[PDB]
Amino acid sequence: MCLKLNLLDHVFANPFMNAAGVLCSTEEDLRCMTASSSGALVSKSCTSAPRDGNPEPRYMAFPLGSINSMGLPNLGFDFYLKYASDLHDYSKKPLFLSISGLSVEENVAMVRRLAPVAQEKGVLLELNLSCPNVPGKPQVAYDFEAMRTYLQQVSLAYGLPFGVKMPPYFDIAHFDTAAAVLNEFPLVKFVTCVNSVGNGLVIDAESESVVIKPKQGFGGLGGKYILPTALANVNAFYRRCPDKLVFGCGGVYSGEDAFLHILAGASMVQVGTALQEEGPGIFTRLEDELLEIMARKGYRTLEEFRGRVKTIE
Amino acid sequence: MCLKLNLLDHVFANPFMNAAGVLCSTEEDLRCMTASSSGALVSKSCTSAPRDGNPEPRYMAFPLGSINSMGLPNLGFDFYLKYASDLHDYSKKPLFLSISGLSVEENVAMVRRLAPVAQEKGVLLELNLSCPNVPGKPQVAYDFEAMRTYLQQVSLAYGLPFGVKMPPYFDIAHFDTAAAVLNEFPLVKFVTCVNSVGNGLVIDAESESVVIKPKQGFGGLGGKYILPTALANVNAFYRRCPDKLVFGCGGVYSGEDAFLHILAGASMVQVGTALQEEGPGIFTRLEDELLEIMARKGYRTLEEFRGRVKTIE
Numbered sequence: 001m002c003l004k005l006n007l008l009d010h011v012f013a014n015p016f017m018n019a020a021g022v023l024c025s026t027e028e029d030l031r032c033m034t035a036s037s038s039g040a041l042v043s044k045s046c047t048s049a050p051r052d053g054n055p056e057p058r059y060m061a062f063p064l065g066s067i068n069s070m071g072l073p074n075l076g077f078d079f080y081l082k083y084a085s086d087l088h089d090y091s092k093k094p095l096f097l098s099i100s101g102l103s104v105e106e107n108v109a110m111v112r113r114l115a116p117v118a119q120e121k122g123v124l125l126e127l128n129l130s131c132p133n134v135p136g137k138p139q140v141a142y143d144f145e146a147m148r149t150y151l152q153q154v155s156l157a158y159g160l161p162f163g164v165k166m167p168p169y170f171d172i173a174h175f176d177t178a179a180a181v182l183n184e185f186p187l188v189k190f191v192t193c194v195n196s197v198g199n200g201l202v203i204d205a206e207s208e209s210v211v212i213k214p215k216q217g218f219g220g221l222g223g224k225y226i227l228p229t230a231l232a233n234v235n236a237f238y239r240r241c242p243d244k245l246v247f248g249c250g251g252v253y254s255g256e257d258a259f260l261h262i263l264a265g266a267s268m269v270q271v272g273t274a275l276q277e278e279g280p281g282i283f284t285r286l287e288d289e290l291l292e293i294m295a296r297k298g299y300r301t302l303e304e305f306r307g308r309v310k311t312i313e
Numbered sequence: 314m315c316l317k318l319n320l321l322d323h324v325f326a327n328p329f330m331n332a333a334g335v336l337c338s339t340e341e342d343l344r345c346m347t348a349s350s351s352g353a354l355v356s357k358s359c360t361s362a363p364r365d366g367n368p369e370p371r372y373m374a375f376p377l378g379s380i381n382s383m384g385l386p387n388l389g390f391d392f393y394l395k396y397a398s399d400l401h402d403y404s405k406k407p408l409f410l411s412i413s414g415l416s417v418e419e420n421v422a423m424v425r426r427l428a429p430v431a432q433e434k435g436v437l438l439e440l441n442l443s444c445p446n447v448p449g450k451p452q453v454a455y456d457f458e459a460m461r462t463y464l465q466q467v468s469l470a471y472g473l474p475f476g477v478k479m480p481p482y483f484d485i486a487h488f489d490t491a492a493a494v495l496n497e498f499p500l501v502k503f504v505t506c507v508n509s510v511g512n513g514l515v516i517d518a519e520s521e522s523v524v525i526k527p528k529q530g531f532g533g534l535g536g537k538y539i540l541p542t543a544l545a546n547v548n549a550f551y552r553r554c555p556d557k558l559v560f561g562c563g564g565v566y567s568g569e570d571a572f573l574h575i576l577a578g579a580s581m582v583q584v585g586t587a588l589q590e591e592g593p594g595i596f597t598r599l600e601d602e603l604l605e606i607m608a609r610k611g612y613r614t615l616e617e618f619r620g621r622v623k624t625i626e
């Protein structure tokens with residue numbers, strides 16, 4: 001009994017991977033993720049130039065989850081490309097490279113250079129749409145006409161199947177609009193739902209203070225706080241994008257949580273906060289737990305139950 | 314040491330009240346909230362005509378919060394107007410009446426008839442801007458032009474101070490835009506942040522099923538899930554609306570949670586999910602708990618710490 005699966009012309013030992021941004025910034029991190037029992041890894045979202053990111057403290061975690069305003073600290077695209085091209089051992093597991101340029105031009109520039117490496121090595125692109133937009137405007141994925149432009153320009157520039165990392169939505173009409181944008185692009189083969197729930201605020205009662213320094217304490221939420229949000233987005237896009245895969249991310253701490261993601265429609269299941277907190281050993285626990293729940297239910301495959309969440313009447 | 318507040322030309326023994334929708338639909342419910350130690354009460358969001366609401370099950374609760382798609386079940390405006398005009402004992406505490414017309418014209422018709430009762434008895438209006446509007450459009454407060462229309466029309470028709478109940482926002486550009494719309498309306502004297510976090514999905518692993526029947530299991534989230542999101546919204550509007558009060562709602566289960574709201578900027582503190590779960594006895598507990606935190610810190614009044622959350626450097 002094993003959890004192996006095939007997606008996107010790659011084979012995976014199991015559906016688990018890190019979430020972008022967690023345990024994936026440096027060569028050390030990527031080698032640690034590659035040594036883990038995860039089925040795949042994704043690199044830290046990158047920009048063309050290296051970034052220091054925001055002042056510390058910029059991440060904090062608590063029993064119910066985490067908050068962050070990292071500010072896209074990363075080693076720069078040339079580093080992640082070199083890692084994909086020369087350093088990653090593809091015999092161990094697939095690699096996803098995450099890009100988050102500050103403009104459409106920057107994304108085009110990076111994807112033109114990634115294309116030949118994707119062809120030669122099979123690295124997979126995850127395009128992070130929680131990225132900077134023009135004056136007055138919300139993040140790109142919350143501006144559907146900007147989103148359409150990014151995807152048009154990246155599709156043309158890259159020319160190969162890729163995925164998109166989405167922020168959560170909270171309104172059925174937004175689900176409908178966003179999925180219709182995505183379904184305009186045949187090269188968008190997977191949608192990862194969700195990025196952190198934007199601009200929450202954690203306050204420490206004793207100190208009477210916010211707990212992260214940037215943005216007056218406001219930052220993206222992950223962990224237990226966000227699991228029903230994440231399940232809703234996974235299922236909403238699973239229903240709306242039948243020709244695409246959905247990757248679930250948000251609130252996974254156990255095999256049971258992974259089970260719920262898969263029942264909602266998830267093909268791969270990403271682990272952010274709980275991975276940051278527990279470390280890469282989590283992957284063996286999650287695999288064991290998921291297999292245990294499958295066994296108790298009589299499921300032998302993921303495909304027996306993926307997307308098969310039941311509704312009432 | 315005391316929890317008293319004076320605002321909106323009323324006096325409140327303490328800042329706690331029910332959140333709209335919870336323990337406020339029937340005369341029995343309203344009498345119960347009136348008999349409780351809460352500092353105020355709000356009636357169930359109403360429509361002109363009575364509504365049965367959505368099929369059951371339509372509310373469920375769990376350790377980390379609740380999900381609902383109640384569908385605005387209510388006894389109709391005339392009932393809530395009568396309660397305000399003839400039944401409520403204003404010597405016990407103040408009363409808010411929440412309205413949630415399905416169109417701007419339905420809201421105008423109701424506010425026109427509320428006005429004289431507001432003027433004579435002092436009932437306070439809370440306009441719910443999570444009213445669905447046209448299906449396939451976002452809820453009203455996620456459509457800034459609709460929101461502006463609603464506020465213009467209601468301000469003209471009512472002519473008296475009122476407040477608004479807001480959904481959470483997740484993007485700084487939305488906080489900026491939403492507050493700016495509200496700040497166009499001088500009669501909007503309070504802003505209640507937040508309504509439920511929209512379209513979450515809870516899935517029960519044993520049964521492999523969603524837990525509520527409407528909308529394929531999608532519904533609004535409350536409780537522990539939503540506290541950092543609620544805090545963020547309270548503080549975002551507190552900072553952006555210096556001539557308005559903010560009332561906090563979301564995730565309050567303890568005096569400490571209430572303290573965090575109030576440090577964020579809350580004047581009144583509303584209690585939804587935890588009240589639904591625990592019953593009106595929660596109000597004595599919350600008061601005691603908040604007074605205990607005040608005593609430890611040496612705070613004698615709420616205003617000593619309201620809005621006084623610290624940021625880092």
Ligand SMILES: Cc1cc2nc3c(=O)[nH]c(=O)nc-3n(C[C@H](O)[C@H](O)[C@H](O)COP(=O)(O)O)c2cc1C
Binds near residue numbers: 249252
């Ligand atoms: C410290 C940190 C850094 C992150 N950086 C990124 C990033 O570079 N790119 C990205 O797509 N998402 C990023 N995220 C979002 C996560 O990939 C994930 O979507 C989010 O944390 C929700 O999953 P979780 O509940 O498992 O934490 C980051 C999250 C954290 C906590």
Ligand SMILES: Cc1cc2nc3c(=O)[nH]c(=O)nc-3n(C[C@H](O)[C@H](O)[C@H](O)COP(=O)(O)O)c2cc1C
Binds near residue numbers: 385507534539
């Ligand atoms: C069962 C139920 C009914 C609700 N009905 C309404 C309503 O009629 N009007 C409204 O403004 N908010 C309504 N809400 C939202 C609550 O007022 C509140 O904003 C939300 O539950 C978050 O607070 P909490 O975390 O304390 O539950 C309802 C919530 C619940 C759980």
Ligand SMILES: O=C(O)c1[nH]c(=O)[nH]c(=O)c1CCc1ccc2ccccc2c1
Binds near residue numbers: 021072101128130195
């Ligand atoms: O690095 C982050 O703060 C981060 N945290 C998340 O929870 N999700 C993300 O997607 C990101 C990075 C998003 C991002 C993407 C591009 C950015 C560009 C300039 C400044 C900040 C930028 C931030």
Ligand SMILES: O=C(O)c1[nH]c(=O)[nH]c(=O)c1CCc1ccc2ccccc2c1
Binds near residue numbers: 358367413441443
């Ligand atoms: O009555 C509700 O379902 C409700 N629940 C909340 O968590 N907050 C709200 O503001 C409301 C009332 C607004 C509302 C919310 C959902 C609805 C679904 C179908 C039909 C009408 C609806 C009206």
